[PDB]
Design an enzyme around this catalytic site. Structure first.
Site, short mmCIF file in Angstrom:
data_model
loop_
_atom_site.label_atom_id
_atom_site.label_comp_id
_atom_site.label_asym_id
_atom_site.label_seq_id
_atom_site.Cartn_x
_atom_site.Cartn_y
_atom_site.Cartn_z
N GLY A 14 10.10 -17.10 55.17
CA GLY A 14 10.90 -18.23 54.73
C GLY A 14 10.17 -19.55 54.64
O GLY A 14 9.04 -19.70 55.13
N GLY A 16 10.28 -23.89 55.15
CA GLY A 16 10.90 -25.05 55.77
C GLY A 16 10.55 -26.31 54.99
O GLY A 16 10.11 -26.23 53.86
N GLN A 17 10.74 -27.47 55.60
CA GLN A 17 10.43 -28.72 54.90
C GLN A 17 8.93 -29.01 54.91
O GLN A 17 8.41 -29.66 54.00
CB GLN A 17 11.20 -29.88 55.52
CG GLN A 17 11.00 -31.22 54.81
CD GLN A 17 11.97 -32.29 55.29
OE1 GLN A 17 12.92 -32.01 56.03
NE2 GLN A 17 11.73 -33.54 54.87
N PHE A 18 8.23 -28.53 55.94
CA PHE A 18 6.78 -28.73 56.00
C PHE A 18 5.99 -27.46 56.31
O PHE A 18 4.75 -27.50 56.36
CB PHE A 18 6.43 -29.81 57.03
CG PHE A 18 7.08 -29.63 58.37
CD1 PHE A 18 6.51 -28.80 59.32
CD2 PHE A 18 8.26 -30.30 58.68
CE1 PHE A 18 7.11 -28.63 60.56
CE2 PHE A 18 8.86 -30.15 59.92
CZ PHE A 18 8.29 -29.32 60.86
N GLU A 20 5.83 -22.79 55.93
CA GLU A 20 6.39 -21.50 55.55
C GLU A 20 6.04 -20.44 56.60
O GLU A 20 4.98 -20.49 57.23
CB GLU A 20 5.92 -21.05 54.15
CG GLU A 20 4.42 -20.94 53.95
CD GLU A 20 4.07 -20.50 52.54
OE1 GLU A 20 4.86 -20.79 51.63
OE2 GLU A 20 3.01 -19.85 52.35
N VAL A 21 6.94 -19.49 56.79
CA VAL A 21 6.78 -18.50 57.84
C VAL A 21 6.43 -17.13 57.25
O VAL A 21 7.11 -16.64 56.35
CB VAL A 21 8.06 -18.37 58.70
CG1 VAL A 21 7.85 -17.37 59.82
CG2 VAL A 21 8.45 -19.74 59.27
N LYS A 35 3.95 -19.47 61.34
CA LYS A 35 4.33 -20.55 60.45
C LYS A 35 3.09 -21.37 60.13
O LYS A 35 2.30 -21.71 61.02
CB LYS A 35 5.42 -21.40 61.09
CG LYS A 35 5.76 -22.71 60.41
CD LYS A 35 7.03 -23.25 61.05
CE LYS A 35 7.50 -24.53 60.40
NZ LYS A 35 8.65 -25.08 61.15
N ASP A 134 21.59 -28.82 65.65
CA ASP A 134 21.92 -27.96 64.51
C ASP A 134 22.09 -26.50 64.95
O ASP A 134 21.51 -25.58 64.36
CB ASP A 134 20.85 -28.06 63.42
CG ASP A 134 21.31 -27.45 62.11
OD1 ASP A 134 22.54 -27.28 61.97
OD2 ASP A 134 20.47 -27.14 61.23
N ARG A 138 23.02 -19.22 61.74
CA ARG A 138 21.89 -19.25 60.80
C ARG A 138 20.57 -19.72 61.44
O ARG A 138 19.50 -19.48 60.86
CB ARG A 138 22.22 -20.16 59.60
CG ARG A 138 22.21 -21.65 59.96
CD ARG A 138 22.62 -22.58 58.83
NE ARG A 138 22.87 -23.91 59.37
CZ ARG A 138 24.07 -24.35 59.73
NH1 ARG A 138 25.14 -23.57 59.57
NH2 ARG A 138 24.21 -25.55 60.26
N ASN A 139 20.63 -20.40 62.58
CA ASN A 139 19.41 -20.86 63.25
C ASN A 139 19.11 -20.08 64.52
O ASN A 139 18.30 -20.48 65.34
CB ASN A 139 19.49 -22.36 63.55
CG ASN A 139 19.60 -23.20 62.29
OD1 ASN A 139 19.17 -22.78 61.22
ND2 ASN A 139 20.19 -24.38 62.41
N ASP A 152 14.25 -23.71 66.95
CA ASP A 152 14.22 -25.17 67.06
C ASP A 152 14.92 -25.88 65.88
O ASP A 152 15.39 -27.00 66.05
CB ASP A 152 12.78 -25.68 67.23
CG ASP A 152 11.84 -25.20 66.12
OD1 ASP A 152 12.11 -24.16 65.47
OD2 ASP A 152 10.81 -25.88 65.90
C1 LIG Z 1 13.48 -15.34 57.90
C2 LIG Z 1 13.33 -14.05 58.62
N1 LIG Z 1 12.72 -14.06 59.81
C3 LIG Z 1 12.55 -12.91 60.52
N2 LIG Z 1 11.91 -12.93 61.81
C4 LIG Z 1 11.34 -14.12 62.42
N3 LIG Z 1 10.81 -14.05 63.74
C5 LIG Z 1 10.27 -15.46 64.12
C6 LIG Z 1 10.49 -16.36 62.99
C7 LIG Z 1 10.03 -17.81 63.10
O1 LIG Z 1 10.26 -18.65 62.24
N4 LIG Z 1 9.30 -18.17 64.23
C8 LIG Z 1 8.83 -19.57 64.31
C9 LIG Z 1 7.51 -19.86 64.05
C10 LIG Z 1 6.49 -18.74 63.69
C11 LIG Z 1 7.10 -21.20 64.11
C12 LIG Z 1 7.99 -22.22 64.42
C13 LIG Z 1 9.30 -21.94 64.67
C14 LIG Z 1 9.72 -20.59 64.61
CL1 LIG Z 1 11.37 -20.21 64.92
S1 LIG Z 1 11.18 -15.58 61.84
C15 LIG Z 1 12.99 -11.70 60.01
C16 LIG Z 1 13.60 -11.68 58.79
N5 LIG Z 1 14.09 -10.42 58.29
C17 LIG Z 1 14.58 -10.43 56.95
C18 LIG Z 1 15.36 -9.14 56.72
N6 LIG Z 1 14.51 -8.01 57.04
C19 LIG Z 1 15.07 -6.74 56.62
C20 LIG Z 1 16.52 -6.68 56.95
O2 LIG Z 1 17.25 -6.91 55.69
C21 LIG Z 1 14.13 -8.00 58.43
C22 LIG Z 1 13.36 -9.27 58.76
N7 LIG Z 1 13.79 -12.83 58.09
#
Ligand SMILES: Cc1nc(Nc2ncc(C(=O)Nc3c(C)cccc3Cl)s2)cc(N2CCN(CCO)CC2)n1
Length: 278
Positions: A14, A16-18, A20-21, A35, A134, A138-139, A152
Site C-alpha cells: 500500500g 501512504g502520504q510519504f 509505500e509498504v 515501508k 484515527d 481500517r487502521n 500508527d
Molecule cells: C495493506 C496490506 N497489508 C498487509 N500486511 C501488513 N503487515 C504490516 C504492514 C505495515 O504497514 N507495517 C508498517 C511498516 C512496515 C512501517 C510503518 C508502519 C507500519 Cl503499520 S502491512 C497485508 C495485506 N493483505 C492484502 C490481502 N492479501 C490477500 C487476502 O486478500 C493478504 C495480505 N494488505
C-alpha cells in the site's frame, strides 16, 4: 541497524502520504513488511519519515505494530515491522459472516477477542499519554490466529471515511467525538469515543459505514447537537450480532462528558470477561 542487502521485495502492499509498504523476504522463509519512501518523495517526506521512526520506536505492546528494525544510516531509508498476513481488519471482517448456531465464518466470542485486543492496545497507548487520533478497523492489522495490531495511522479504498476541506486537516469525522469536531480537542477520552465506533464496526462486521446514510454535513450537525444537549442527538444503532449489554457499553463510549466515558482498562475487562455472560 539492519542491512537492506538481506531484503527481497516481493509484493506492494500500500501507499501512504510519504511512504509505500512492500512485502519482503529475509534470507536469514521469513516475511516482513517494509515501508520505504515513495518515488516522488520530497525532502518534506523524508522528514516525516524519520519522525515516524522516532515515534514508532516508542511503541512496544503485543497489540500495537512494532518496529523490528530500521535502515536509516544510509539511503534508501526503510522501516521494518512484522508482516500481518491477513491485511487490515476492515477488509478482513468484510470477508466473514457471523457464525450460525444451526463464505468464511467468525464467532461472536471471536469478535469480542478481536475487540479486546484493540482495547488492550489502546490501554497501552493511554499509559504513554499517546492519543491515536484515527482509530478505526481500517487502521488495524490482522496476523495469524486472529492477532490484532493497531497501526500508527493510514489510502483510497477508505477515502470516504475522511472529511476534506482545502487547507484543513483531513478528518475522520464519523469516528470523532463531538468535542473533536467542534473544538479540535483530541484526548484519550476521544480515542475512547472512536473505540466505541470501532467496536460498532467489529460488531457490524464492517458491513456499513458509521452514519452511512447521513451526509458529512449532518454528521457535523449531529456533533453540535451533542453540544446543545437538548436530546436531539443521534447514535449508531445496535448491530445484529450485538447483545444489549455490549451495546450499552458502546453507548457509554459516546457520553457527552469525557469523564463519563469508560477507561480502556474497563473496556478491556468487559470485552474479555463480562461480555461472555448470558
Ligand atoms: C495493506 C496490506 N497489508 C498487509 N500486511 C501488513 N503487515 C504490516 C504492514 C505495515 O504497514 N507495517 C508498517 C511498516 C512496515 C512501517 C510503518 C508502519 C507500519 Cl503499520 S502491512 C497485508 C495485506 N493483505 C492484502 C490481502 N492479501 C490477500 C487476502 O486478500 C493478504 C495480505 N494488505
Amino acid at each position: 541497524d539492519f542491512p537492506r542487502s538481506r531484503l527481497r521485495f516481493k509484493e506492494k502492499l500500500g501507499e501512504g502520504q510519504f511512504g509505500e509498504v512492500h512485502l519482503c523476504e529475509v534470507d536469514s522463509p521469513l516475511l516482513v513488511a517494509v515501508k520505504i519512501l515513495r518515488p516522488d518523495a520530497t525532502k518534506n517526506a523524508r522528514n516525516d519519515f524519520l519522525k515516524e521512526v522516532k515515534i514508532m520506536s516508542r511503541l512496544k505492546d503485543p497489540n500495537i505494530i512494532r518496529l523490528l528494525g530500521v535502515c536509516v544510516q544510509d539511503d534508501p531509508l526503510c522501516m521494518i515491522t512484522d508482516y500481518m498476513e491477513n491485511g487490515d481488519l476492515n477488509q478482513f471482517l468484510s470477508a466473514h459472516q457471523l457464525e450460525d448456531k444451526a463464505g468464511p465464518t467468525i464467532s461472536y466470542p471471536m469478535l469480542l477477542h478481536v475487540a479486546a485486543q484493540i482495547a488492550s492496545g489502546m490501554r497501552y497507548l493511554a499509559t504513554l499519554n499517546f492519543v491515536h487520533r484515527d482509530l478505526a478497523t481500517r487502521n488495524c492489522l490482522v496476523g495469524e490466529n486472529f492477532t490484532i495490531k493497531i497501526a500508527d495511522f493510514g489510502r483510497n479504498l477508505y477515502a470516504g471515511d475522511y472529511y476534506r476541506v482545502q487547507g484543513r486537516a483531513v478528518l475522520p469525522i464519523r469516528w470523532m467525538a463531538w468535542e473533536c469536531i467542534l473544538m479540535g480537542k483530541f484526548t484519550t477520552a476521544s480515542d475512547v469515543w472512536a473505540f466505541g465506533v470501532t467496536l460498532w464496526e467489529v460488531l457490524m462486521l464492517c458491513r456499513a459505514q458509521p452514519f452511512g446514510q447521513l451526509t458529512d454535513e449532518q454528521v457535523i450537525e449531529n456533533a453540535g447537537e451533542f453540544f446543545r444537549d437538548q436530546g436531539r442527538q443521534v447514535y449508531l444503532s445496535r448491530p445484529p450480532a450485538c447483545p444489549q449489554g455490549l451495546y450499552e457499553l458502546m453507548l457509554r463510549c459516546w457520553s457527552r462528558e469525557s469523564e463519563q466515558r469508560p477507561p480502556f482498562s474497563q473496556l478491556h475487562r468487559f470485552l474479555a470477561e463480562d461480555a461472555l455472560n448470558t
